[PDB]
Amino acid sequence: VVNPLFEKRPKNFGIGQDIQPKRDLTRFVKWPRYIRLQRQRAILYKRLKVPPAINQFTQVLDRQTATQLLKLAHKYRPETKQEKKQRLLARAEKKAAKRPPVLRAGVNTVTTLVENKKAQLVVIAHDVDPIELVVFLPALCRKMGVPYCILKGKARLGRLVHRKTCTTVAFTQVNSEDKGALAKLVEAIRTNYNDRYDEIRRHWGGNVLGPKSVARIAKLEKAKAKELATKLG
């Protein structure tokens, strides 16, 4: 049933044999300056010995604790723009014939109430652009005995409030029913951040050579290890 016309014409992609195919070159592209800049700035955070104060933001909350955290931080979002008006209306018709506990946003307010010991839990975004804004909060929390935790994403911390990005978030008070969930989190957080603050304040990051240049050293070391592994007999 096969047709004797449909020949099979294989190409030889050897050197000088036939024109190389339209391969993939996403590795060898000449990128724009801004792309190459941020792509090789992410490498300096792997080559440079990063002090522990900045390195303490890589050890972040896991992927299972994060969900339950934002689950609890969804019952205490601030009010919208429309709910702000509709409260002025329900207050109007209240006048004609308590404030609920909610989240608390911003560094200038979280720090000022961590000093006042008003907070019960602090969430910090792990990728603040100028890190100086939250370099100190870890130590100020450990010092005051406030349970803090670093969360991955100032754009996901920023959906709790109705803004683009946020930096920190604080649970001052919670309702009765959710006080159990808050105490079931404060435990698993304080045992991960405040308890081991000694070993967090000492852990330098970065300082890791590129794989192309760690394989050139693992190979030479291998040759000198298999030397003693083969010359002894």
């Binding site: 002090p51 652009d129 100028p130 804004l133």
Partner: protein, 100 residues
């Protein structure tokens, strides 16, 4: 609050601030000589110098070459009395910040 970032930006000889000032200086050294910044790098020093975070306020980052002001004259030859034979070690009367 800002008073933490303030006292932090005074230990420029520390470890964290000598790492940050160095990755910042490296990244700045790769961009153009005069380019607009998205947001104030130092938000505190900017408030202190009058930057309210509202529309209309713009932040430009700009780099200037350090060193004094060599006198713009032909090869050497500043024709005059020996008093004004100086070309090399001269200094400019406006700070590099005023030139930025």
């Amino acid at each position: 609050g800002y008073k933490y970032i303030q006292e932090l930006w005074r230990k420029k000889q520390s470890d964290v601030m000598r790492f940050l000032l160095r990755v910042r200086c490296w990244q700045y050294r790769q961009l153009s000589a005069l380019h607009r910044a998205p947001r104030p790098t130092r938000p505190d020093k900017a408030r202190r110098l009058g930057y309210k975070a509202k529309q209309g306020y713009v932040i430009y980052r700009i780099r200037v070459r350090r060193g004094g002001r060599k006198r713009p004259v032909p090869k050497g030859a500043t024709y005059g009395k020996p008093v004004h034979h100086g070309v090399n070690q001269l200094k400019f009367a406006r700070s590099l910040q005023s030139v930025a």
